[PDB]
Design a protein around this motif. Sequence first.
Motif, PDB file in Angstrom:
ATOM      1  N   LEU A   1       0.877  -1.211   0.000  1.00  0.00           N
ATOM      2  CA  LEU A   1       0.000   0.000   0.000  1.00  0.00           C
ATOM      3  C   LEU A   1       0.892   1.232   0.000  1.00  0.00           C
ATOM      4  CD1 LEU A   1      -2.005  -1.350   3.003  1.00  0.00           C
ATOM      5  CD2 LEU A   1      -2.438  -1.764   0.564  1.00  0.00           C
ATOM      6  N   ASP A   2       1.715   1.333   0.999  1.00  0.00           N
ATOM      7  CA  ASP A   2       2.637   2.484   1.100  1.00  0.00           C
ATOM      8  C   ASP A   2       3.683   2.362   0.006  1.00  0.00           C
ATOM      9  OD1 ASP A   2       4.349   4.414   1.624  1.00  0.00           O
ATOM     10  OD2 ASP A   2       4.657   3.947   3.702  1.00  0.00           O
ATOM     11  N   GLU A   3       3.240   2.286  -1.207  1.00  0.00           N
ATOM     12  CA  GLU A   3       4.189   2.159  -2.340  1.00  0.00           C
ATOM     13  C   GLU A   3       5.005   3.435  -2.463  1.00  0.00           C
ATOM     14  OE1 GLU A   3       2.079   1.122  -5.762  1.00  0.00           O
ATOM     15  OE2 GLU A   3       1.471  -0.814  -5.035  1.00  0.00           O
ATOM     16  N   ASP A   4       4.842   4.326  -1.532  1.00  0.00           N
ATOM     17  CA  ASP A   4       5.632   5.581  -1.552  1.00  0.00           C
ATOM     18  C   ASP A   4       6.855   5.330  -0.686  1.00  0.00           C
ATOM     19  OD1 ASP A   4       3.831   6.858  -3.116  1.00  0.00           O
ATOM     20  OD2 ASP A   4       2.648   7.556  -1.457  1.00  0.00           O
ATOM     21  N   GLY A   5       6.713   4.469   0.288  1.00  0.00           N
ATOM     22  CA  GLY A   5       7.866   4.151   1.171  1.00  0.00           C
ATOM     23  C   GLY A   5       7.985   5.243   2.218  1.00  0.00           C
ATOM     24  N   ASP A   6       7.000   6.086   2.289  1.00  0.00           N
ATOM     25  CA  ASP A   6       7.033   7.178   3.298  1.00  0.00           C
ATOM     26  C   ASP A   6       6.621   6.597   4.649  1.00  0.00           C
ATOM     27  OD1 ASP A   6       4.546   6.487   2.751  1.00  0.00           O
ATOM     28  OD2 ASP A   6       3.771   8.457   2.353  1.00  0.00           O
ATOM     29  N   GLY A   7       6.361   5.315   4.693  1.00  0.00           N
ATOM     30  CA  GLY A   7       5.947   4.687   5.975  1.00  0.00           C
ATOM     31  C   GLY A   7       4.554   5.194   6.316  1.00  0.00           C
ATOM     32  N   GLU A   8       3.767   5.477   5.310  1.00  0.00           N
ATOM     33  CA  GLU A   8       2.392   6.011   5.556  1.00  0.00           C
ATOM     34  C   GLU A   8       1.418   5.447   4.522  1.00  0.00           C
ATOM     35  OE1 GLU A   8       2.828  10.153   5.407  1.00  0.00           O
ATOM     36  OE2 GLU A   8       3.875  10.301   7.284  1.00  0.00           O
ATOM     37  N   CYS A   9       0.152   5.403   4.859  1.00  0.00           N
ATOM     38  CA  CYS A   9      -0.883   4.885   3.912  1.00  0.00           C
ATOM     39  C   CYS A   9      -2.055   5.864   3.888  1.00  0.00           C
ATOM     40  CB  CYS A   9      -1.350   3.502   4.370  1.00  0.00           C
ATOM     41  SG  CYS A   9      -2.925   3.087   3.575  1.00  0.00           S
ATOM     42  N   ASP A  10      -2.435   6.308   2.727  1.00  0.00           N
ATOM     43  CA  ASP A  10      -3.561   7.273   2.634  1.00  0.00           C
ATOM     44  C   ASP A  10      -4.882   6.516   2.614  1.00  0.00           C
ATOM     45  OD1 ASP A  10      -1.808   9.280   2.571  1.00  0.00           O
ATOM     46  OD2 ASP A  10      -1.777   9.489   0.427  1.00  0.00           O
TER      47      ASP A  10
ATOM     48  N   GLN B   1      -6.949   6.280   0.307  1.00  0.00           N
ATOM     49  CA  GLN B   1      -7.005   5.529  -0.979  1.00  0.00           C
ATOM     50  C   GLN B   1      -6.101   4.294  -0.893  1.00  0.00           C
ATOM     51  OE1 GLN B   1      -5.920   7.742  -4.426  1.00  0.00           O
ATOM     52  NE2 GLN B   1      -5.923   6.030  -5.780  1.00  0.00           N
ATOM     53  N   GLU B   2      -4.940   4.424  -0.300  1.00  0.00           N
ATOM     54  CA  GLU B   2      -4.017   3.258  -0.209  1.00  0.00           C
ATOM     55  C   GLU B   2      -4.575   2.202   0.745  1.00  0.00           C
ATOM     56  OE1 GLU B   2      -0.105   4.422   0.631  1.00  0.00           O
ATOM     57  OE2 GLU B   2      -0.010   5.889  -0.942  1.00  0.00           O
ATOM     58  N   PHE B   3      -5.146   2.620   1.830  1.00  0.00           N
ATOM     59  CA  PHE B   3      -5.721   1.646   2.801  1.00  0.00           C
ATOM     60  C   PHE B   3      -6.937   0.960   2.165  1.00  0.00           C
ATOM     61  CE2 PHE B   3      -9.688   2.061   5.418  1.00  0.00           C
ATOM     62  CZ  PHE B   3      -9.690   0.728   5.849  1.00  0.00           C
TER      63      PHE B   3
HETATM   64 CA    CA Z   1       2.136   6.065   0.898  1.00  0.00          CA
END
Ligand code: CA
Lengths: 12, 12, 91, 91
Positions: free
Chosen positions: D60-69, D71-73
């Motif tokens: 989900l956190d395909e950004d790697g920011d260690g966070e999930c929006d 939309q990602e969740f």
């Molecule tokens: Ca993310």
Amino acid sequence: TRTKIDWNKILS
Amino acid sequence: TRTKIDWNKILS
Amino acid sequence: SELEKAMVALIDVFHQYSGREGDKHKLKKSELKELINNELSHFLEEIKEQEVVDKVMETLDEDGDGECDFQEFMAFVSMVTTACHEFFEHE
Amino acid sequence: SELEKAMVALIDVFHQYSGREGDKHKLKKSELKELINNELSHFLEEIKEQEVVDKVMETLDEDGDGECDFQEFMAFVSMVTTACHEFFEHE
Ligand SMILES: [Ca+2]
Ligand SMILES: [Ca+2]
Ligand SMILES: [Ca+2]
Ligand SMILES: [Ca+2]
């Protein structure tokens, strides 16, 4: 009669 | 008091 | 843990309209139009033209094969879920 | 039209755990771990290690920011929904 799917299949 | 969101906002 | 009973509902919704007609394994824009108009009749999205469906399919059917897979259709709910949430503001 | 009541459940599930602690606007792997273990305790996914969470976040956190929006969740549910559906075979 109870079984669990697979976490590994879901991870990849 | 009833209103509809926007289909256009959802399309893009 | 509502996601528990809600997930069961989404799994049933998948077979409720997908197996209604045509190929139950994949969703064609015609079947999806029924999904969008049958589950979101006048609640937020009203479908009367193929243009909404055509634009909505490019959003899911990003393959352009004129088809939507279970994974692609599931994402449509997220987009509408995200838009519906916006309806709620600070107040 | 179950997607109607089910969508309301998903919208509530979003605030049910996301605003539990930390930033309600974004989900951090720690909050998501609670979401996966609190909504899918032992039904299909049991979380006891950060590795599942770390592998699940890269999904989900395909950004790697260690966070999930949101939309990602929301996509995480689709992945589990797709896997749960596989549980049902021809029989
Ligand atoms: Ca993310
Ligand atoms: Ca189908
Ligand atoms: Ca496609
Ligand atoms: Ca949060």
